[PDB]
Amino acid sequence: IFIATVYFMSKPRHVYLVDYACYKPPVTCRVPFATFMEHSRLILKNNPKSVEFQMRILERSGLGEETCLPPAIHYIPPTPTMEAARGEAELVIFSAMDSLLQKTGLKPKDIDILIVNCSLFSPTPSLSAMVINKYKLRSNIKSFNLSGMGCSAGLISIDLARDLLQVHPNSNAVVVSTEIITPNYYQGNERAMLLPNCLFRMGGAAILLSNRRRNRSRAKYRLVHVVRTHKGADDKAYRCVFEEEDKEGKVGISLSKDLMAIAGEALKSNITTIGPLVLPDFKQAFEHFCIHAGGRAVIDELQKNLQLSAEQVEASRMTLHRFGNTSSSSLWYEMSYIEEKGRMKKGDRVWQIAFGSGFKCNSAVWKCNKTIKTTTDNPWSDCIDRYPVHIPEIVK
């Protein structure tokens, strides 16, 4: 026997998405359009042009009336402090982690890898450190905290987990994708940097991954692929989403005018690297698509490029509507949507696309390990009945 000695020994391990918990923002936090515009008028009294720009950007963003913002951003002078950001981080991360631990029955002593990704908020000790302290994790845990890597960092985390799971047998990896938006709020009137204020909302997700063979039946999905693209080499595609300062000393995320075109290119490259891998022309390769909810414009561009139907690009639109731009964790809200409509059959291929600053564009392919039953503990438990709502072209 020589074929077995060269096949099984050098066979990649299977990485399973055992479960995940999405954060459900409090039902007493919504930020309606009218309240947002009233506060915006109050903050930008001396810049009516900025107010008009914000109104135009927010009235065609596809967001709903149930999106949530941190308590610190509630005051008409929004004063984001370090304590407020830490409190929001604790809230979201611990809620998602508690939901995950109750769902999976996982013990804190069983967590071998812990990867936390959150772009803007990078405290010290890290976010993974506060998770470890909260759950008293093992003293020999592989704790990683990625920051500054944008909205695609979510999938990056998954990739990292996968790699680690190939090196360490019988291990569990917890991946916490979030974006604490209290420090991300832009305290200025520069038009280019006011988009994140209009679009970004609260969210988060705690994901459990495992190569353990005992999870070959409990697992929801089985990670097939994680493709990555980094257009940072191109100078134009590097400055696309650039954190910087305005002419008044305020830090914000300036978005380039050409951010559309470059984004397109990146996506194309990714679908040129994921095509041959899944090739037995993508609307028939996969059964479900999770396009990152980065604004209805990019979703429309991807739909017109890949020739997706209204129902295929529906979890992304409805996730943008219900939760807004929850950043790297949005990919998971979309997942929940597909699961809760009773559309997650066994063997179904799910393709997640997450594109963000860098300019990075990553994608992942999962396969449904088991048919997913509709559940009550989830971020869609109440609003799933109304959806798919009719998102209007312009709201007032």
Partner: protein, 360 residues
Amino acid sequence: NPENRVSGIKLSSVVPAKATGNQDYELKNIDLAMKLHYIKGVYFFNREAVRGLTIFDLKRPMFQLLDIFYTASGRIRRPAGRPFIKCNDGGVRIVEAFCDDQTIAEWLAMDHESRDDCLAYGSELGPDLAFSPLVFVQFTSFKCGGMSLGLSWAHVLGDPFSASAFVSMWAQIMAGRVPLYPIKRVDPVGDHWQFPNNCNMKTHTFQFTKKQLDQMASNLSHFEVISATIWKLLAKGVVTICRYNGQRENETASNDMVLSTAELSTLIADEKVLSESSDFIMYGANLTFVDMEEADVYGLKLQGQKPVDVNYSINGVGEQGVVLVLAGPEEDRGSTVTVVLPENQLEKLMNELNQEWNLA
């Protein structure tokens, strides 16, 4: 300057838990006829009632409460046409205030000029009607402790009884309970909805004890006694008493005031003026004697406690004056009298009341 007694306030908004739906809400002719007056109601609570109560604890019941009062978070919209309360959830405006300088007792003992205008924050509707909050709720925390709840309520939304019901429902939900023309016509105001202050009329609060009220009634209920005494000590042609209808509970804000024009104690004891779309005013138009004795302001239950003082006042008063009569702080029933007069009339009333009961 009493207006500077509070140094720094934090403003925020609170919205209904469930999106109302942006449905329209037509306003009756009576409502549009009182779109210039506002209610300022301040409740005081001692240190016990605020035992370990944070901002979130106070703001939590507001979401359910506004789910009930779906119009309290709406905004005025116009089609030139008649305004209506669009139910888009702009929310009510919450104002957190700190008064480290003084305590509740100092406020109770300080002069009443510009006294509670800084405990109940809130502007008028305009000049930007589409973005004007209809309700301002201010929680003020003093030096030694205790909390003051100041409600600024747009009268177009509802009568003062509706404001008292709003506060009472707030308290109950926090506890845990599960739910000579009488009306003058004036010049157009456009989209600012604020009566101009042609004169320098002043406001003052008088406190009457049970013994004083029963003693001064001999020369003439509590309301009739106070009204007759004020009329006799003020005129030294008609009076428009307001009574409202207190048969309401767990209901949305409504405006169902009852007027009574009397052409002096006997006059006190015993409707188509609005044409279609003018700008009207009746408070301080013909010496209104508004009352809230048929309310239960002191029946609030905050942490198993009751308010130590309730002050109700009217903004947008006309040229004549407004007399507000309210139940006193239990014990030996008293009476709080928040009244606005032109400076001279207020001075005469103060002199007469100081001569009689040494009240000034």
